[PDB]
Design a protein around this ligand. Structure first.
Ligand SMILES: Cc1cn([C@H]2C[C@H](O)[C@@H](COP(=O)(O)OP(=O)(O)OP(=O)(O)O)O2)c(=O)[nH]c1=O
Ligand SMILES: [Mg+2]
Lengths: 1005, 218, 419
DNA sequence: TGATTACGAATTGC
DNA sequence: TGACGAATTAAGCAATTCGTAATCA
């Protein structure tokens, strides 16, 4: 015991209910501690002295204040006070569930009560005292007084950890394998013990090989075993029978690892292993509790998550292991699905997205090419990660399209050197990534010998090691520790719930500190309400520098400024006509003076009402602002840690963490506008949105048409607080620190919620950046007030605006100069959408570039641009239709599967259901799949497209286009030409072309 | 009544016409699990796996669903004790007698009531080991229950934890009730009023209520 | 699954049965429970119905227009007058037919309906007939009781009912015009009778018969008639001086009657009824300048624009007439009802219902006009949007804003004192 | 045989 | 002797693009 660092907390669901803590000491010993586990209720003193059977145990919480947080509408200024009571409260713990009539604080979990009432953090280091501990087993103690046992906290210390990464490969005939016909061919393991030793080993099924091949393999260097007791993990390749392989797997999976990590293993790998082991032998994989009092069998279970939108309906599925020994079974597939957004979530796509590096050509000739990667080619740390993955990789993708096989690999001190088998490439720098492999697995299983067995072994060991590479790339350990500390949740539950559950721990701590309880009496009513304000862009092309100004955490800061909480709302005053409106306004401005109370005007709730005012108190801080302050502090900490990072992996990890905290802070406001939530407050959400709109309008009015001359800045309007009079200066004459000879004018063009795009009549970016920095300083010092603060994001060049949320530009960061490479930025266009095409994107890119070049040159005699573009597009489309050289991969679209549809006909659900009926592999309820448009080959060019959804087909990994089938090019061509037409300026010629090519009328802006 | 042949035991499946559009798939699903399944003594006997496939489905209105047959002495037709000894049928008869007022009886059979089809999700179970054949039956179970749901109006599922995700197992929505199992300890089925709710729902869907006293055996 | 679910489903079914005979509140409750049931059972046999066009044709058939034959069983006769037809349900609102709305009814009538509903639960629906604020039980149907005692207890409750008639027939007889005249003299009432409904003991369906003939009569002029307090009834006289009655002013302004014209009319032995189903602003302005500029239309009635006064405040408050502001407080503390009703109700609402303007027109007059106030009192009013000048009744409202502001100021400074 | 509008679903930006 | 739970449910609105049904000359 003594000094322990916590690893996991978990429950036991046997005859008696317990709670378990797993920890490690300094030397490396593992310690288990067992706690009795109670049901927690909160009652008043009167209820406590009237419980018919006395409770098991009760602890006094002191005097607490109960507030009714229901909202009612008032038609005059005689507003009744909120119902507030003060009483002595008791916290009762019961071994079994009980029903108490008037118990409060019933939305919080039991584990949260354990942690908070006992003063324990799930991820801390402690110095336990043995006086309160009793030894019940070798390595397992029992604690009855967790408050005294965990009284002493100590600084963090590092501990060793153990890991198992695994993968399997199964035989198949024509499609997905089946556990009743198809055996396991390969099983690969990466094993890390508490001593730091890293072992890689692969087991090969020898039952699908000939005896001569077995003898040849043994003479080649492999080891042959006939029994489970003669297996050594220090041998790379071991061949055996299927029963021995399954027994080795069962032996490994019953150990007390800290983490067992798989990719889509809970649904395929472990399920297949368990089922095959039960079919061949009769054995089972058995998990045991730390006290050796409970035994369970491995059985994967399914959790279904439904939607909160209309009809609700199921929207996601996830699979879990039912172990009770403290080991965490982690599936990277679900984690990556919930974390980032990609086109496909197969392992190849994730590998291509994660492990990519820029490489320099060093040699050419014959059918091979040599690439080198170093810190002087891409960035700091990319070459090292690529070299780490190259230790086991077999195939490399060059220039996003070519697939090549590795011939030789060398690992250097700062990078890598690789030799690949690819055709001659005429350039100096290319992009290499780890992705798809061009092997036909079914054909390889059709004719099976020793060489294919060894190659499959290499592929399987790479698959096993990819789990570790992804585990390190995404920083799962740091995220787990931070989440356990912040959310007051066990380590195994951090990535399992949404915003409504991960804010309950901090909320309970806040409520206990403030001595406050919130209650509801009547039902909740939902009404529509408005949101952010988006300005209409003033032009399409700019050819002038644009400066981007943004707010910092706008809605959280609005909530903090206005003290917007459900319990700080004095009331809502409405009126049905102007006479009462005037009377109420005159009375309200003097009953509730500005400095302490804040009044917010809003759009009316119902058709008859013509006015609505909400009043909020600022004397006592609310509950939602304190939560927001907590999350804002966490985000600031992780931004500061990101600022000091050097390598790429650490930078990515810290960026992800700060993004997560930002999204949680915004989810708090969203919940405050969510009807089925405990923190529901319609008035507060409406007021937050109204104040945001006022703030952006204030900034835009100050910045539009503002000019600097001499060393002086003149804003357009008066710097007056749009809510009430204050003590600040209101002079639009501000002294600057810029050179005197400067003279510039600023005009606003676009804005979304908390952002302003300010155009400057200049072209150089150094001067623009300097002016922007000075403007940001002046705005923060003089224009804004209280906790409102703006940031200078970037400088945009060649800004092209299509619509209110679609633009492309070149971006220069704030810490950049003229001699720095910019960044291409697309926002909302047909290049980031996951449902457009890969043909559409390439054509859009080439034609946009050609149009920009032609506009730079400039002919426009009468209609030269339009005629040239239309002729080129017609030629390209006709050539594509006739030659049919583009593969199917350029014509695949992606979509998610769910069951949240009004009406059950719904062609999409029908398509997925039929695919699941006619195919072995099943598409699940939160899974993205590919589909395309296919038609019979003999059909000619079609003008009038009548039914389109009938032609959708699902493209699985083994799909081959038949000799009587062709891609329905017409749909894609129509979409692409509708995109192109809107960019040009002519209308008659475009309409004529569209009606000739497709026989329909186009739609314009 | 049409007969189809399979490679393994019972070598014969005879079915009503209403089950026609499923049988082919059923056969292709039974030829890959039969050899493994038939290595153990099972209740019911192999010859009585598919005896509920002779009941027409176009005249039924309610389905009462279990999860697995009795561990021992399984008759093939779900929820049946020819000698009235199993606890579940005894207690369901007690509840229905309390509802309708009949006091003197000697047996209850859910298979006689008009408009009601009793069903088991898993069609077999090892002697003494319940829920031991889930992997063999899974696909067949989903397929047959989905066919049944397409005809009935109310689906009554007995067993809270077993049917916790019944909506994920069914594509088309249907009227669903999940209740406690009869043999559940802690006396939770006594306070359940599912049968009256069934009648109310049926008459709310322009359908005839179920004569629940029709099943008593004298 | 529990008992509460059974009760909820039972009440949902009961509400589904009686849907056409339902108001907004019942419809909202039924929709809410439909949503709840769909949520908990994943599917339900009923959907959410919103429009719900009220109709009562289920219990009635086509009106006979020719003599027919009757014979078997005892017959119960209930007469039907001319007026607005209303529906009252079990513990529900008091709705219009076809255009069901929360029509304002006297509180005494509300109490009588509440007690008659609490008397027994065996009532399906009640059919009201109105004519010039004269409230009648037209029809009272039931599946268990008999249409005899219910009207007796309703009469003893404090509201009067027509003399339901019971007759016995043993021989084959022909119901014709002579028998209609006999029945007409048999009710023995001066109220306008239109049709007669005959029912039999046991049969729930009710069959009504009416006899009428066509005639052509000239229209001379339109004149208001005195039928209460600040309420007028239009009336048109004939060249021969005959009295042609009408149910509603809606009948006139939908009839599009022109000055000095001839129209068709259903003529009977005693009186006659004008036939409808022969733009709207033209008709309303035409009738407005016909009857006289000093008039206005209050929904389905006609009303004056008079100067009102403190008597027009004291009358409703059930207090003695007086002309001193201090006195208008003492009776307020003398009666608990008066002080309760002055405290609970607002100032704008009470001062509006003093002078009897309607709701909609006054509201749309206020919401397009600027005010200037000082210490909770109005001192300046001006118009901003001139569009509202299209409707002449709006000009009638504008004609007397000074009286309204005077009574508003008086009410505000008396509320400032009585609290 | 077209025009025009209305609605649901998917995806993105704050 | 003949199942229960574990596996406590869930952020907001603004804007565009596409296919199909419903309403209109
Ligand atoms: C992105 C996002 C924004 N919003 C709302 C809340 C924000 O106040 C408003 C503007 O969003 P952003 O400006 O994108 O978010 P932010 O203001 O917090 O940016 P920063 O991290 O630099 O401080 O939009 C959400 O409610 N949910 C979201 O996911
Ligand atoms: Mg911002």
């Amino acid at each position: 015991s003594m000094d322990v660092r916590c690893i996991n907390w978990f429950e036991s669901h046997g005859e008696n209910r317990f709670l378990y803590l797993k920890s490690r000491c300094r030397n490396g010993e593992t310690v288990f501690i067992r706690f009795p586990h109670y049901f927690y209720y909160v009652v008043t003193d009167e209820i406590y002295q009237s419980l018919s059977p006395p409770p098991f145990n009760a602890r006094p919480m002191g005097k607490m204040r109960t507030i009714d947080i229901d909202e009612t509408i008032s038609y005059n200024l005689d507003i009744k006070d909120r119902k507030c009571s003060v009483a002595d409260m008791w916290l009762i713990e019961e071994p079994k569930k009980r029903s108490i009539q008037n118990a409060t604080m019933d939305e919080f979990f039991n584990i949260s009560w354990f942690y908070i009432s006992n003063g324990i953090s799930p991820d801390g280091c402690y110095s336990l005292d043995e006086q309160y501990l009793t030894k019940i087993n070798n390595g397992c103690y029992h604690c009855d007084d967790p408050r005294n046992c965990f009284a002493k906290e100590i600084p963090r210390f590092d501990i060793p950890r153990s890991y198992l990464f695994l993968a399997i490969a199964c035989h198949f005939d024509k499609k997905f394998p089946s556990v009743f016909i198809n055996p396991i061919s390969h099983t690969s393991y990466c094993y890390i013990d508490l001593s730091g030793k890293r072992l890689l080993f692969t087991l090969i099924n020898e039952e699908m090989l000939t005896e001569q091949e077995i003898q040849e393999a043994v003479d080649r260097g492999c080891l042959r075993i006939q029994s489970l007791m003669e297996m050594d993990y220090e041998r790379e390749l071991v061949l055996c029978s299927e029963i021995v392989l399954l027994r080795i797997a069962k032996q490994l999976l019953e150990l007390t690892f800290d983490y067992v990590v798989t990719f889509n293993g809970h649904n395929f790998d472990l399920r297949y292993i368990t089922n095959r082991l039960e079919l061949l032998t009769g054995e089972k994989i058995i998990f045991r509790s730390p006290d050796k009092k409970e035994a369970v069998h491995l059985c994967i279970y399914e959790r279904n998550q439904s939607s909160h939108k209309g009809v609700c309906g199921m929207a996601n599925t996830t699979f879990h292991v039912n172990n009770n020994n403290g080991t965490i079974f982690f599936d990277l597939y679900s984690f990556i699905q919930k974390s980032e957004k990609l086109d496909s979530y197969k392992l190849d796509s994730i590998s291509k997205n994660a492990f990519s590096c820029m490489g320099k050509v060093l040699n050419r000739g014959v059918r091979e090419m040599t690439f080198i990667g170093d810190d002087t080619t891409d960035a700091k740390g990319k070459a090292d990660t690529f070299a780490k993955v190259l230790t086991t990789g077999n195939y490399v993708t060059v220039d996003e399209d070519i697939i090549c096989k590795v011939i030789r690999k060398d690992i250097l001190e700062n990078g890598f050197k690789v030799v690949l088998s690819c055709p001659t490439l005429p350039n100096d720098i290319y992009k290499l990534s780890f992705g798809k492999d061009d092997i036909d697995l079914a054909q390889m299983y059709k004719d099976y010998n020793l060489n294919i067995a060894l190659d499959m072994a290499r592929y399987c060991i790479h698959d096993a090691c990819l789990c570790q590479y992804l585990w390190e790339y995404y920083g799962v350990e740091t995220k787990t520790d931070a989440g356990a500390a912040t959310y007051v949740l066990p380590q195994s539950m951090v990535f399992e719930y949404r915003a409504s559950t991960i804010i309950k721990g901090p909320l309970l701590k806040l409520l206990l500190e403030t001595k406050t309880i919130l209650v509801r009496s009547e039902t909740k009513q939902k009404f529509p309400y408005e949101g952010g304000k988006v300005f209409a862009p003033k032009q399409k092309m700019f050819s002038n520098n644009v400066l981007i100004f943004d707010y910092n955490s706008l809605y959280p800061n609005v909530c903090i400024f206005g003290n917007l909480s459900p319990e700080t709302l004095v009331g809502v005053v409405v009126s049905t006509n102007r006479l009462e409106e005037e009377i109420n306004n005159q009375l309200l401005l003097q009953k509730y003076p500005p400095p302490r109370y804040i009044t917010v005007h809003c759009e009316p709730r119902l058709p008859n009402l013509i006015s609505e005012i909400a009043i909020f108190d600022r004397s006592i801080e609310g509950t939602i602002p304190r939560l927001l302050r907590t999350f804002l502090a966490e985000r600031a900490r992780y931004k500061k840690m990101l600022k000091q990072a050097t390598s790429s992996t650490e930078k990515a990890i810290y960026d992800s963490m700060q993004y997560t905290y930002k999204i949680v802070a915004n989810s708090v406001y969203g919940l405050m506008g969510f009807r089925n939530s405990a923190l529901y407050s319609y008035a507060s959400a409406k007021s937050c949105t109204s104040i945001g709109r006022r703030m952006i309008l204030y900034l835009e009015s100050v910045l539009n048409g503002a000019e600097l001359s001499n060393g002086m800045l003149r804003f357009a309007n008066t710097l007056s607080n749009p809510f009430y009079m204050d003590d600040r200066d209101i002079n639009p004459i501000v002294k600057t620190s810029l050179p005197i000879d400067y003279r510039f004018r600023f005009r606003s063009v676009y804005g979304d919620t908390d952002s302003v795009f300010t155009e400057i009549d200049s072209q150089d970016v150094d001067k623009s950046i300097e002016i922007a920095k000075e403007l940001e300083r002046l705005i923060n010092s003089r224009v804004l007030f209280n906790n409102f603060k703006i940031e200078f994001e970037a400088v945009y060049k060649n800004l092209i605006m299509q619509s209110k949320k679609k633009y492309t530009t070149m971006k220069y960061s704030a810490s950049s100069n003229s001699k720095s490479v910019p960044e291409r930025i697309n926002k909302g266009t047909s290049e980031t959408r996951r449902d457009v095409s890969k043909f559409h994107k390439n054509m859009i890119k080439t034609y946009k570039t050609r149009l920009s070049e032609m506009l730079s040159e400039g002919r426009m005699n009468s209609n030269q641009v339009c005629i040239d573009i239309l002729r080129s597009l017609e030629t390209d489309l006709r050539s594509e239709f006739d030659s049919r050289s583009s593969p199917l991969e350029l014509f695949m679209l992606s979509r998610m599967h769910h069951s949240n549809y009004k009406s059950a006909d719904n062609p999409n659900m029908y398509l997925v259901t039929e695919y699941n009926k006619n195919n072995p592999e099943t598409i699940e309820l939160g899974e993205r799949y590919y589909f395309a448009y296919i038609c019979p080959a003999n059909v000619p060019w079609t003008k009038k497209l009548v039914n389109i959804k009938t032609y959708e087909t699902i493209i699985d990994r083994s799909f081959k286009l038949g000799s009587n089938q062709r891609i329905f090019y017409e749909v894609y061509f129509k979409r692409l030409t509708s995109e192109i037409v809107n960019l040009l300026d002519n209308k008659v010629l475009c309409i004529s072309f569209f009606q000739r090519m497709f026989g329909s009328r186009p739609t314009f802006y | 009544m049409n007969s189809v042949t399979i490679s393994h035991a019972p070598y014969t499946i005879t079915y009503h016409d209403d089950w026609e559009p499923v049988m082919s798939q059923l056969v292709e699903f039974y030829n890959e699990v039969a050899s493994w399944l038939l290595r153990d003594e099972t209740s019911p006997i192999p010859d009585k796996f598919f005896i509920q496939l002779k009941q027409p489905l176009r005249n039924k209105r309610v389905c009462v669903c279990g999860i697995d047959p009795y561990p021992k002495d399984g008759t093939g037709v779900p929820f049946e004790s020819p000698n009235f000894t199993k606890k579940s049928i005894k207690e369901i008869a007690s509840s229905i007698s309390r509802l309708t007022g009949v006091i003197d009886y000697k047996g209850y059979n859910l298979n006689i009531i008009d408009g009601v089809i009793p069903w088991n999700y898993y069609l077999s179970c090892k002697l003494g080991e319940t829920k031991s054949h889930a992997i063999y039956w899974d696909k067949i179970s989903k397929l047959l229950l989905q066919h049944i749901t397409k005809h009935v109006s109310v689906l009554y599922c007995l067993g809270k934890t077993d049917f916790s995700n019944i909506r994920a197992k069914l594509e088309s929505p249907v009227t669903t009730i999940v209740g406690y199992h009869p043999a559940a300890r802690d006396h939770q089925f006594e306070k359940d009023r599912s049968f009256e709710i069934i009648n109310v729902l049926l008459e709310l869907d322009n359908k005839t209520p179920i004569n629940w006293a029709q099943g008593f055996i004298y | 699954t529990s008992s509460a679910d059974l009760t909820n489903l039972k009440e949902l079914l009961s509400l589904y049965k009686s849907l056409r005979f339902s108001d907004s509140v019942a419809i909202e409750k039924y929709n809410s429970l439909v949503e709840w049931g769909t949520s908990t059972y994943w599917k339900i046999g009923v959907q959410k119905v919103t429009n719900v066009e009220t109709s009562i044709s289920d219990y009635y058939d086509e009106v006979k227009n020719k003599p027919f034959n009757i014979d078997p069983g005892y017959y119960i006769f209930l007469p039907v007058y001319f007026g607005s037809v209303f529906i009252y349900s079990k513990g529900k609102n008091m709705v219009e037919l076809g255009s069901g709305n929360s029509f304002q009814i006297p509180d005494e009538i509300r109490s009588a309906c509440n007690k008659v509903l609490d008397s027994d639960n065996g009532i399906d629906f009640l059919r009201f007939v109105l004519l010039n604020n004269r409230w009648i039980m037209e029809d009272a149907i039931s599946k268990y009781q008999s249409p005899v005692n219910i009207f007796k207890l309703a009469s003893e409750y404090g509201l009067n009912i027509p003399n339901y008639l019971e007759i016995e027939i043993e021989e084959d007889t022909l119901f014709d015009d002579e028998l209609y005249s006999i029945m007409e003299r048999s009710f023995d009432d001066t109220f306008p009778k239109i049709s007669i409904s005959y029912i039999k003991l046991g049969e729930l369906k009710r069959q009504v018969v009416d006899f009428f003939k066509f005639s052509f009569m000239y229209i001379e002029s339109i004149k208001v008639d005195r039928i209460g307090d600040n309420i007028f009834i239009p009336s048109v006289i004939t060249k021969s001086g005959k009295k042609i009655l009408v149910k509603d002013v809606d009948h006139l302004i939908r009839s599009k009657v022109r000055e000095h014209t001839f129209v068709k009319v259903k003529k009977k032995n005693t009186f006659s009824i004008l036939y409808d189903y022969d733009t709207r602003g033209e008709v309303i302005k035409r009738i407005i300048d016909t009857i006289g500029r000093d008039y206005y239309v209050n929904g389905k009635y006609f009303s004056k624009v008079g100067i009102a006064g403190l008597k027009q405040l004291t009358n409703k408050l059930d207090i003695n007439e007086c002309a001193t502001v201090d006195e208008l407080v003492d009776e307020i503390n003398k009666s608990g009802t008066v002080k309760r009703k002055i405290k609970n109700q607002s100032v704008f609402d009470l001062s509006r219902e003093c002078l009897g303007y309607p709701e909609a027109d006054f509201i749309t007059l206020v919401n397009n006009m600027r005010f200037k106030i000082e210490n909770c009192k109005v001192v300046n009013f001006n118009i901003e949007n001139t569009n509202c000048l299209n409707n002449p009744s709006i000009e009638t409202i504008y004609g007397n804003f000074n009286q309204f502001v005077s009574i508003f100021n008086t009410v505000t400074d008396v509320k400032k004192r009585l609290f």
